[PDB]
């Protein structure tokens, strides 16, 4: 009988039941989407988009809803934190219900196509055999795809008839769904320009309509039909898989480096923002300018929004997780409550000292303080007996500007050391570790989990492409080579051209 | 709610095990 790994090949020449399988797959996917959202809503806390945004809570579908403009709940809250809204039907809840109704309706259609498999439509009128004209199917579906792609960019993203998409400032502080105008010049190919996304869909949609029209009207060349086995639906599976893993790599890449469509309020910061100290530069630009403009130290740092300070903390760096450290980032370091303040270390000579920040590569990292020039002036020693830079010896103190501890100074060595231990993580925050029984170990963000899954699936689908393409091109020997292959076709020199039996000498 | 978290596994197995028994017996019936 069939081996287990081949049970679904019974659909290869059964267009009706193929459609029924595909319907059932689509139902299951739409059902998952609905089920995932509903779980996420049952567990999401909307009370603090500053220090407990969705990306800290292990929300995975919510940001994709928010990306395209679904931002409120029937409960009256919104993800931007405004209260009193009415979102209308297309709330998170309503999106979830629609996908569930869709899943239900797909499920019935599947039943019907499974029972009434033998539609005359699927029969070649010349032979009576089942037959799909795949070249024309491509033109039709391509045309449909072009229409939808065009409409998505022309009406949804622009706001002509739709909500727009999530946009923000460069530091992820004031995001919202806004209509977006197409950028038609060369900066539309910049991944960080949201208008490029509008232009892309409008232009590519039109190209898809034209190609669609081409592929409906113009028949494939004989040379290409035979080379690509266009009578064989498995050549479509092969090239379709290829296209899917291409796309999967792209979306993993843009998720990891970041683009206009992976904004940091929905997915969290990138690791590169930590590498380059993106937020620390900006924060210092603001303090520096608060101070030139008169303000005191207390005042310059109290001016730093907590949301910006919280980006400048390695626990939101997606490259700090672990494969089996499960769940929301809040399960690790806890639920962020408050910025404690910016910590300023001085030695006994009043020199300002800087904690060397932990790089993402390091699970643990030592505590080393430096002056503005990079010279080591204090550390926490491992071996004490020859230590020369201890906090005790260098009389290190920590003062706090802004936040909860603003205007407080600590001199007792164990306390100073303790904030030094945290300052390697960047800015210092107060966490609630009890509410989730947080274990204190960093986890990755949705940006991390999504990249991992899609890069892995992409690589696996590459093997799918190879398998099914081999199967398309070698269908005639799938079961084995010809038992009357003769040694003359395989031994050398017999034929001038390999395998070409017309080229003997 | 502070429920017994062995209740999940007990409910799960309570369903899975006898149902699998039933299915195994039905499918081998259909193939003879």
């Amino acid at each position: 009988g069939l081996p287990w790994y081949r049970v679904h090949t019974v659909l290869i020449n059964d267009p009706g039941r193929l459609i029924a399988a595909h319907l059932m797959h689509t139902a299951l996917v739409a059902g998952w989407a609905g089920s995932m959202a509903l779980y996420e809503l049952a567990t999401f806390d909307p009370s603090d988009p500053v220090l407990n945004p969705m990306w800290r809570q292990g929300m995975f579908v919510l940001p994709f809803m928010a990306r395209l403009g679904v931002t409120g709940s029937w409960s009256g809250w919104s993800i931007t934190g405004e209260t009193g809204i009415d979102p209308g039907f297309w709330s998170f809840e309503g999106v979830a219900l629609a996908h569930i109704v869709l899943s239900g309706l797909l499920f019935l259609a599947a039943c019907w196509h499974w029972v009434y498999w033998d539609l005359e439509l699927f029969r070649d009128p010349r032979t009576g055999e089942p037959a799909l004209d795949l070249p024309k199917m491509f033109g039709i579906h391509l045309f449909l795809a072009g229409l939808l792609c065009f409409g998505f960019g022309a009406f949804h993203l622009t706001g002509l008839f739709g909500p727009g998409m999530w946009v923000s400032d460069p530091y992820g502080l004031t995001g919202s769904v806004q209509p977006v105008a197409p950028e038609w010049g060369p900066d539309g190919f910049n991944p960080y320009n949201p208008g490029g996304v509008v232009a892309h869909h409008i232009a590519a949609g039109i190209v898809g309509i034209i190609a669609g029209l081409f592929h409906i009207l113009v028949r494939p060349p004989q040379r290409l039909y035979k080379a690509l086995r266009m009578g064989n639906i498995e050549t479509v599976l092969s090239s379709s898989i290829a296209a899917v893993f291409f796309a999967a790599f792209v979306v993993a890449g843009t998720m990891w480096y970041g683009s206009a469509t992976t904004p940091i309020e929905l997915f969290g910061p990138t690791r590169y923002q930590w590498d380059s100290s993106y937020f620390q530069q900006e924060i210092n630009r603001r303090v520096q300018a608060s101070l030139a403009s008169g303000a005191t130290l207390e005042e310059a740092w109290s001016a730093i929004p907590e949301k910006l300070a919280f980006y400048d903390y390695i626990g939101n760096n997606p490259a700090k997780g672990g494969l089996f450290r499960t769940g929301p980032m809040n399960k690790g370091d806890g639920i962020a409550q408050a910025w404690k303040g910016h910590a300023v270390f001085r030695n006994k000579e009043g020199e300002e000292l800087f904690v060397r920040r932990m790089p993402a590569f390091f699970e643990s990292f030592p505590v080393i303080l430096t002056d503005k020039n990079g010279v080591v002036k204090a550390d926490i020693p491992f071996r004490r007996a020859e230590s020369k830079y201890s906090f005790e010896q260098q009389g290190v103190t920590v003062s706090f500007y802004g936040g909860e501890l603003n205007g407080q100074t600590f001199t007792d060595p164990p306390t100073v050391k303790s904030y030094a231990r945290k300052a390697i993580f960047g800015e210092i925050f107060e966490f609630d570790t009890e509410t989730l029984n947080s274990d204190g170990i960093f986890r990755t963000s949705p940006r991390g989990w999504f990249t991992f899954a899609h890069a892995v699936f992409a690589l696996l689908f590459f093997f799918g492409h190879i398998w099914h393409g081999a199967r398309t091109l070698f269908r005639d020997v799938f079961s084995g080579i010809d038992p009357e292959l003769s040694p003359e076709q395989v031994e050398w020199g017999f034929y001038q051209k390999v395998g070409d039996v017309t080229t003997r000498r | 709610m502070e429920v017994n978290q062995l209740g999940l596994i007990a409910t799960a197995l309570f369903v899975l095990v006898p149902s699998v028994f039933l299915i195994i017996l039905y499918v081998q019936t259909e193939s003879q």
Binding site: Y39, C111 | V3, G7, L8, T11, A12
Partner: peptide, 30 residues
């Protein structure tokens, strides 16, 4: 977890109903 579990079992039964009506052994007149 307990809500999901109660809902899942209820949902399995509704699916049993469907198969037991529409995919029953047809009664036939031997």
């Amino acid at each position: 977890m307990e809500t999901i579990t109660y809902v899942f079992i209820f949902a399995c039964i509704i699916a049993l109903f469907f198969f037991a009506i529409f995919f029953r052994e047809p009664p036939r007149i031997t």
